[PDB]
């Protein structure tokens, strides 16, 4: 928090502190964003995946460098920026309260947040899993074609628990809908065959089929 | 070779082992206390693995026994080494999942560190 603002001198001191905190936060944000280009270069080096000759040191050197950069530098910079932002917000709130004092409805008187979007997705997955129980709702949702969206976008991304929950939800969505089962089987078979076409050409193609196979196994498991 | 004998071909003070036989030897017959001098040695050598020459039929039998024993030990070692394969496969499967998880020396994925320890540590040895 900040000292209460009761006089014009206190308001001026709060304004000066807010300006100084803004400058410090700008510097911290610039420093944090600086690591981004180096992070990109390190990511490029790692994506090369080139074998190299030399157990704590057994890992790829680029991987260790990236871990040190992000977990060590980026985390510290983010923490400092968050602390500065919290202090600035507290000062602004105190100044606004002082100005209002000088001067439902009474109670009334970030968008690009990847974590927030992920939480929204997880909550949506849980809610869909719940709503799946009503068989009529199940048919309605299948008509909405959520199966394709789930397979396409949310199937692979997200946490492992999210992956298992999504597999369960997909299974439940195809509880007894023969047309839906046919559609899902068709999608899985198509992806598998497309991968198998270039099997002799790309090991990664074989590598990137695990989720579909797990989904098929889960579907077969539920009688 | 494995053993050597170096003699001062042409030409106690430490252990007080008075060699009644050799009054003034180059070195003590017991202590090697060399009143004449002290000698240090070094060799531009590389370690070598070999066996003593087999000259008698008894040497042949001893060699056959040693070979059988070495074969048995090697079989045990080979079975042990081949054993690590399934664990490595399971760890590789877990890593291929690439499941995000929450907790920079230890910042890496736990599966990755475990796989590194298994392969680089056990398999190499």
Q: How far is A124 from chain B (nearest CA, A)?
A: 19
Residue A124 at interface with chain B, using a CB cutoff of 8 Å: no
Q: Is the dihedral of CA B7, B10, B15, B21 positive or negative?
A: positive
Of residues A170, A123, A120, A119, the one with CA closest to residue A142? A170
Most B CBs within 10 Å, among A47, A52, A55, to test the B interface: A55
Please compute, for residue A93, the number of CA atoms within 13 A of its CA located in the half-sphere on the CB side. 10
Where b means 16+ CB within 10 Å and e means fewer, A179-188 reads ebeebbeebb
Q: How far is B48 from chain A (nearest CA, A)?
A: 26
Residues 6+ apart with CB under 8 A from B62: B54
Q: Are B1 and B18 in contact (CB under 8 A)?
A: no
Q: What is the CA radius of gyration of chain A?
A: 26
Contact B108 A63 (CB under 8 A): yes
- Rounded Cα distance, B89 and B20, in Å: 72
Token pair for A47: 């994506």
CB atoms within 10 A of CB B115: 21
- Rounded Cα distance, B21 and A16, in Å: 101
| DSSP 8-state class, residue A57 | T
Q: Are A126 and A165 in contact (CB under 8 A)?
A: yes
Using DSSP, state whether B2 is helix, strand or coil. Answer: coil
Using DSSP, state whether A110 is helix, strand or coil. Answer: coil
- Rounded Cα distance, B108 and B115, in Å: 11
With DSSP H G I counted as helix, E B as strand and the rest as coil, what are the percentages for chain B, rounded to 5?
45, 0, 55
Count of all residues that appear for chain A in the document: 223
Q: How far is B44 from chain A (nearest CA, A)?
A: 28
CB pairs under 8 A between A and B: 40
- Rounded Cα distance, A142 and A132, in Å: 10
Among all residues of chain A, which has the CA nearest to that of B108?
A67
- Rounded Cα distance, A135 and A121, in Å: 23
- Rounded Cα distance, A102 and A10, in Å: 13
Residue with tokens 């949310």: A154
Using DSSP, state whether A131 is helix, strand or coil. Answer: helix
Residue A35 at interface with chain B, using a CB cutoff of 8 Å: no
- Rounded Cα distance, B12 and B24, in Å: 10
Residues 6+ apart with CB under 8 A from B32: B14
Q: Which residues of chain A are within 8 Å of residue B96 when distances are taken between CB atoms?
A: 207, 210
Q: How far is A191 from chain B (nearest CA, A)?
A: 18
Residues 6+ apart with CB under 8 A from B63: B51, B54
Q: How many secondary structure helices (H) and strands (E) does chain B include?
A: 2, 0
Cβ-nearest to B108 among A67, A160, A163:
A67
Q: How far is B103 from chain A (nearest CA, A)?
A: 11
Of residues A153, A159, A155, A170, the one with CA closest to residue A221? A170
Token pair for A99: 């100005």
Among all residues of chain A, which has the CA nearest to that of B92?
A207
Q: Which residues of chain B are within 8 Å of residue A71 when distances are taken between CB atoms?
A: 104, 107
CB atoms within 10 A of CB A156: 14
Residue A100 at interface with chain B, using a CB cutoff of 8 Å: no
Burial class (CB in 10 A: 0-12, 13-18, 19+), B10: exposed
Token pair for A68: 């040190």
φ/ψ region of A7 (left if φ > 0, alpha if ψ in -120 to 50, else beta) reads: beta
Of residues A127, A147, A144, the one with CA closest to residue A136? A144
Contact B120 A210 (CB under 8 A): no
SS in 3 state form for A172-200? HHCCCCHHHHHHHHHHHHHHHHHHHHCCC
Among all residues of chain A, which has the CA nearest to that of B120?
A55
Q: Are A166 and A154 in contact (CB under 8 A)?
A: yes
Residues 6+ apart with CB under 8 A from A215: A155, A167, A170, A188
Contact B99 A160 (CB under 8 A): yes
- Rounded Cα distance, A153 and A216, in Å: 17
| DSSP 8-state class, residue A5 | -
Could you write out the DSSP letters of every residue in B34-77?
A: -SS-------------------SHHHHHHHHHHHHHHHHHHHHH
Q: Which residues of chain B are within 8 Å of residue A64 when distances are taken between CB atoms?
A: 104, 108
Token pair for A148: 């394709």
- Rounded Cα distance, A116 and A111, in Å: 8
Resolution (A): 3.4
Residue A43 at interface with chain B, using a CB cutoff of 8 Å: no
């Amino acid at each position: 928090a900040v000292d209460p603002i009761e006089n014009e001198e206190d308001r001026k001191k709060a304004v000066s502190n807010i300006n100084t905190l803004l400058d410090k936060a700008d510097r911290v944000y610039h420093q944090l964003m600086g690591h981004r280009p180096q992070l990109e270069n390190l990511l490029c080096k790692v994506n090369e995946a080139a074998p190299e000759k030399p157990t704590s040191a057994s890992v790829n050197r680029y991987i260790l460098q990236l871990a040190q950069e992000y977990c060590g530098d980026c985390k510290n910079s983010f923490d400092e920026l968050s602390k500065i932002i919290q202090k600035v917000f507290a000062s602004r709130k105190e100044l606004l309260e002082y100005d209002l004092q000088q001067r439902s409805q009474y109670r009334a008187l970030s968008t690009k947040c990847y974590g927030c979007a992920s939480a929204v997705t997880e909550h949506c997955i849980t809610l869909l899993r719940a709503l799946a129980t009503n068989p009529a709702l199940r048919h309605i949702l299948v008509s909405q074609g959520l199966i394709r969206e789930l397979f396409d976008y949310n199937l692979r991304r997200g946490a492992a628990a999210m992956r298992e929950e999504v597999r369960q939800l997909m299974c439940l969505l195809t509880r007894d809908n023969p047309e839906a089962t046919q559609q899902m089987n068709d999608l899985i078979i198509g992806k598998v065959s497309t991968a198998l076409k270039g099997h002799w050409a790309n090991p990664d193609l074989a590598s990137s089929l695990q989720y579909e196979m797990l989904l098929l196994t889960d579907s077969i498991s539920k009688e | 070779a494995s053993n050597l004998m170096i003699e001062f071909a042409d030409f106690c003070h430490k252990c007080r082992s008075i060699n009644y036989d050799e009054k003034d030897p180059f070195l003590c017959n017991a202590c090697g206390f060399c009143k004449y001098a002290r000698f240090d040695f070094m060799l531009y050598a590389k370690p070598c693995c070999a066996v003593d020459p087999i000259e008698n039929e008894e040497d042949r039998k001893k060699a056959v026994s040693n070979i059988n024993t070495l074969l048995d030990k090697a079989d045990r070692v080979y079975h042990q080494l081949m054993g690590h394969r399934p664990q490595l496969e399971n760890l590789l499967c877990k890593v291929n999942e690439a499941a995000p998880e929450k907790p920079t020396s230890a910042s890496v994925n736990r599966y990755i560190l475990q796989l590194a320890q298994e392969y680089c540590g056990d398999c190499k040895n």
